[PDB]
Design a binder for this molecule. Structure first.
Ligand SMILES: [Zn+2]
Ligand SMILES: [Zn+2]
Ligand SMILES: [Zn+2]
Ligand SMILES: [Zn+2]
Lengths: 587, 267, 134
């Protein structure tokens, strides 16, 4: 009972072949049945021949034989075909108008979401078609990630390296990046979860580093299981309609303009005359400064600082304790940082994530790393918050979401989601003028590279940001990257200047950083998990020159973390000749 | 320095004298039971991070009331504060307090436990299950503290012998009621944890000599009303003391009242 | 809180009916047939005029479902059949079906507990509680 997802016409039927059970009206249901292998349709009664011992389920072969669906073998003398006249018999058989966008729905209902074209369709279809496509993609991705091992914790070394274990013939654990694992500790005869943890590659051979919430200790026998969830039918669209007001509706201007946020104050007015403000936020250039300056700019407006992961809200909390009074601040964390009141929608400043905040409505809500976000979550947030103003902090020239199912082709920075799609068509509305992190060295190169020279060269030319020439001798295994010639090269180069024994080692795959820390001793940094984390001295080796380690935005976000100097060892020349850095030889 | 003392002494009187040294954690030699992968056993140990402040009384006389204050990491601070917030109703929990002091340019957290006892249960258990006449200062102190006997009693030799001087039994008699009270409070506390959904274990070293509890470091959370305690080690270790001190002698009185006649049983 | 009284039943029956040559179960749930049911229920009717009246009726027991406190009924203490305990009782559960919802809504346990104390001086029957404030 409801409006069909292809016609908005009131129907009662759902395709049995589709996992998501989409409402389809008689005309559009018939079209979808005949357009794919969707011979299963669910209604008040499941469209199956309810005869003793029968198995036929297709609506085309089914006949309304009396008060029972029947095939030809089990039909009584009187029968009636359901799948007929281009509209299967059912509720409101007259008012089924039919649809035009049918084949896109069929391809959405049948694509495995492996080719890049599937995601192109997912980001280029109609509104509700895009919503349903995101729903189906989420369901498929969740049900795919349930064929792995149980991380039985054994030989806990210190408070970083539990050393883990696996259940022999099953585990395929991608310990890299944000792969959430929950821990279960068995007490007597009962068992109970502990909390989610991310896990990381870590030093040497099995000293795997962990990190997460649940500030408890750890114990042996607390086996970890890869988390899974359930999909909920989205309601809201990707983005609310945009309208520009003639005045700051519902807010009042500021009584004092702070100097550090004055450059952001020039953008703190137009956030108030439009429904939402789009920002091509440069990597780490005081986006948190913009957020806290807006908070101080509108102290009477109720603001929600939301983000995909809580580590993104970590910098928000840092800048909050920098300037935001603790009294009017909430830090919602489900069962990370908790220095505010937890799970309290009644607050001036609200800190939370996309997975824990319930339904609410504010005046302005900030949402960061919109490049990291997906249109599914971009609609979830709309189905949870109806704030007077929105703002989407994030530049698709920073990082994509890890679409692990995306195997064929690559997704464009605009095609990450809808808000990043308009990041190139309508572009930004405000912009972070002053560069709060990088000097002229990195800023000039990244601005001439992809930011269209709009990033002002902030500090002086570093001249310690060495670019290293190397050809490549690389070896790999099951899931780990190893570059022994590169490890030796960076060992030789690091010995030339002992001051570089503080530069963190960055790696496209954190197992290359693991073998480095086994030989180099420098800490590990994911090129993906690099935003926020920043150091004056950094050393990074490309390991491989492939698109997953040589795309422009990836190394942009990796290099925008170098405050003073970066030791970038690359095996390629597309960026080497593009880079205007200080060129050095090969150790 | 002194402002740290003033902050620690929150609202209850001001009769504190620092047994430690300002911000220095005084070290003590105490009995402990601990089992964590690397080590396991029940024997004496050296406690370090415990700034002890013995509260005195009017006329500057000392009394058994020690405002132990402990410093630790930040995650532990929040975890303990949450858990103590859950269970701050049962009369079996010693009063707690949470704040963060600035000894230097360091936001180090603090945890305050007020009106404790100088010795824990584990000390009393280990004092009798490991008796040695050559080193029995702790037992003498415990006995003289609660008016079990006068200190002059330790001059007549073989006071600690059973066969000679059987009066030693009548001295151990005046410790049963304390153990019975401790058992009652343990039952109350266990009921509270199972009510609010706590999973963990208990040990004699955490309970004072009045029954109050503390040290909720290793407790996890579940769905409320499904918390399961573990008490096998507690009871098994405490078990031999009960007959030795004659804990349950009150049960034969009219209404478990020491000032009441005997229950007149039918023949 | 006492609700068993089996020993007092046996005491009284032995003190006054010593030589009655027949098995008497104070709790009729152990009888062998309806003849035994009547024979035991007769004595039960005699004895239970001594015990206090407030200890008859349903037996409640607080249980927890998905971390929520509930007051249900697990048995009855009749004036003539003794004590009957429910066989299948679930202490902890996540979510309720329709039948369980129905049997819990029908029970007088929550309505009685959530109500207020009532003393009625019009009648002489045993009051329990009220539900509204008038
Ligand atoms: Zn379908
Ligand atoms: Zn339709
Ligand atoms: Zn058939
Ligand atoms: Zn009978």
């Amino acid at each position: 009972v409801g409006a069909c997802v292809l016609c908005n016409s009131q129907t009662s039927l759902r395709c049995g072949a589709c996992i998501r059970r989409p409402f389809l009206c008689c005309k559009c249901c018939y079209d979808h049945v005949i357009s794919t292998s969707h011979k299963l349709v669910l209604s008040v009664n499941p469209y199956v021949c309810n005869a003793p011992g029968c198995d036929v389920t297709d609506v085309t072969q089914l006949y309304l034989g009396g008060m029972s669906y029947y095939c030809k073998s089990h039909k009584p003398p009187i029968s009636f075909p359901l799948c007929a006249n281009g509209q299967v018999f059912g509720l409101y058989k007259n008012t089924c108008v039919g649809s035009d966008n049918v084949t896109d729905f069929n391809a959405i209902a049948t694509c495995d979401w492996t080719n890049a074209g599937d995601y192109i369709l997912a980001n280029t279809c109609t509104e509700r078609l895009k919503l349903f496509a995101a729903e189906t993609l989420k369901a498929t991705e969740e049900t795919f990630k349930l064929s792995y091992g149980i991380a039985t914790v054994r030989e806990v070394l210190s408070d970083r390296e539990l050393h883990l274990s696996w259940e022999v013939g099953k585990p395929r654990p991608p310990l890299n990046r944000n792969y959430v694992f929950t821990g279960y500790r068995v007490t007597k005869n009962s068992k109970v979860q502990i909390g989610e943890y991310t896990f990381e590659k870590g030093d040497y051979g099995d000293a795997v580093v962990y990190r997460g919430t649940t500030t408890y200790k750890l114990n042996v026998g607390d086996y970890f299981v890869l988390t899974s969830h359930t999909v909920m039918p989205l309601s809201a669209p990707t983005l609310v309609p945009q309208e520009h007001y003639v005045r700051i509706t519902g807010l009042y201007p500021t009584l004092n303009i702070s100097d550090e946020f004055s450059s952001n104050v020039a953008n703190y007015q137009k956030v108030g005359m439009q429904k939402y403000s789009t920002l091509q936020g440069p990597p780490g250039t005081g986006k948190s400064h913009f957020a806290i300056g807006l908070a101080l700019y509108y102290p009477s407006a109720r603001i929600v600082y939301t983000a995909c992961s809580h580590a993104a809200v970590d910098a928000l909390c840092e800048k909050a304790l920098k300037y935001l009074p603790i009294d009017k601040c909430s830090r919602i964390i489900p069962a990370c940082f908790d220095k505010f009141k937890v799970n309290s929608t009644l607050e001036q400043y609200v800190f939370c994530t996309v997975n824990a905040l319930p339904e609410t409505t504010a005046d302005i809500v900030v949402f960061d790393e919109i490049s990291m976000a997906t249109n599914y979550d971009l609609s979830v947030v709309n189905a949870r918050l109806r704030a007077k103003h929105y703002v989407y902090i994030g530049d698709p020239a920073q990082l994509p979401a890890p679409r692990t199912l995306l195997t064929k082709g690559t997704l464009e920075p605009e095609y990450f989601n809808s808000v990043c799609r308009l990041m190139k068509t309508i572009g930004p509305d405000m912009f972070l003028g002053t560069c709060r992190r990088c000097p002229a060295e990195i800023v000039d190169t990244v601005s001439a590279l992809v930011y269209d020279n709009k990033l002002k060269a902030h500090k002086d030319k570093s001249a310690q940001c060495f670019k290293m020439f190397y050809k490549g001798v690389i070896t790999h295994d099951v899931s780990s990257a190893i570059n022994r010639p590169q490890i030796g090269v960076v060992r030789e180069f690091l010995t030339r200047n002992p001051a570089w024994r503080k530069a963190v080692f960055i790696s496209p795959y954190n197992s290359q950083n693991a073998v480095a820390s086994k030989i180099l001793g420098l800490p590990t940094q994911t090129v993906d998990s690099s935003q926020g984390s920043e150091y004056d001295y950094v050393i990074f080796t490309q390991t491989t020159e492939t698109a997953h380690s040589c795309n422009v935005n990836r190394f942009n976000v990796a290099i925008t973390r170098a405050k003073v100097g970066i030791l970038c060892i690359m095996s390629d020349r597309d960026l080497y000749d593009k880079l205007q850095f200080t060129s050095l030889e090969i150790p | 320095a002194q402002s740290f003392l003033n902050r620690v002494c929150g609202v209850s009187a001001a009769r504190l004298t620092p047994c430690g040294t300002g911000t220095s954690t005084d070290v003590v030699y105490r009995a402990f039971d601990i089992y964590n992968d690397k080590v396991a056993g029940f024997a004496k140990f050296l406690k370090t991070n415990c700034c002890r402040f013995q509260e005195k009384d009017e006329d500057d006389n000392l009394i058994d009331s020690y405002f132990v204050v402990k410093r630790h990491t930040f995650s532990n601070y929040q975890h303990e504060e949450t858990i103590y917030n859950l269970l701050k109703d049962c009369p079996a929990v010693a009063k707690h307090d949470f704040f963060k002091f600035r000894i230097d340019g360091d936001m180090v957290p603090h945890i305050s436990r007020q009106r404790l006892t100088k010795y824990t249960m584990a000390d009393l258990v280990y004092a009798l299950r490991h008796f040695d006449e050559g080193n029995c200062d702790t037992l003498k102190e415990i006995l003289v503290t609660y008016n079990c006997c006068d200190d002059d009693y330790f001059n007549k030799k073989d006071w600690y012998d059973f066969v000679e001087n059987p009066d030693i039994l009548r001295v151990y008699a005046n410790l049963g009621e304390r153990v019975r009270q401790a058992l009652l409070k343990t039952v109350q506390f266990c009921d509270a944890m199972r009510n609010a959904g706590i999973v963990g274990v208990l040990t004699l070293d955490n309970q004072d000599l009045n029954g109050n509890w503390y040290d909720f470091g290793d407790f996890i959370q579940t769905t409320p009303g499904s918390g399961v305690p573990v008490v096998d080690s507690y009871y098994s270790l405490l078990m031999p003391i009960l007959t030795l001190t004659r804990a349950l002698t009150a049960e034969s009185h009219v209404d478990t009242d020491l000032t009441k006649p005997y229950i007149k049983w039918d023949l | 809180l006492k609700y068993d009284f089996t020993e007092e039943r046996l005491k009284l029956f032995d003190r006054y009916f010593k030589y009655w040559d027949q098995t008497y179960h104070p709790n009729c749930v152990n009888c062998l047939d309806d003849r035994c049911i009547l024979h035991c229920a007769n004595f039960n009717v005699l004895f239970s005029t001594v015990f206090p009246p407030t200890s008859f009726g349903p037996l409640v027991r607080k249980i927890f479902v998905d971390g929520v406190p509930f007051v249900v009924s697990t048995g009855y203490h009749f004036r003539e059949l003794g004590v009957v305990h429910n066989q299948d009782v679930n202490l902890h559960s996540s979510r309720l079906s329709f039948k369980e919802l129905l049997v819990y809504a029908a029970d007088p346990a929550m309505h009685a507990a959530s109500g207020n104390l009532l003393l009625d001086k019009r009648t002489t029957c045993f009051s329990v509680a009220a539900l509204t404030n008038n």
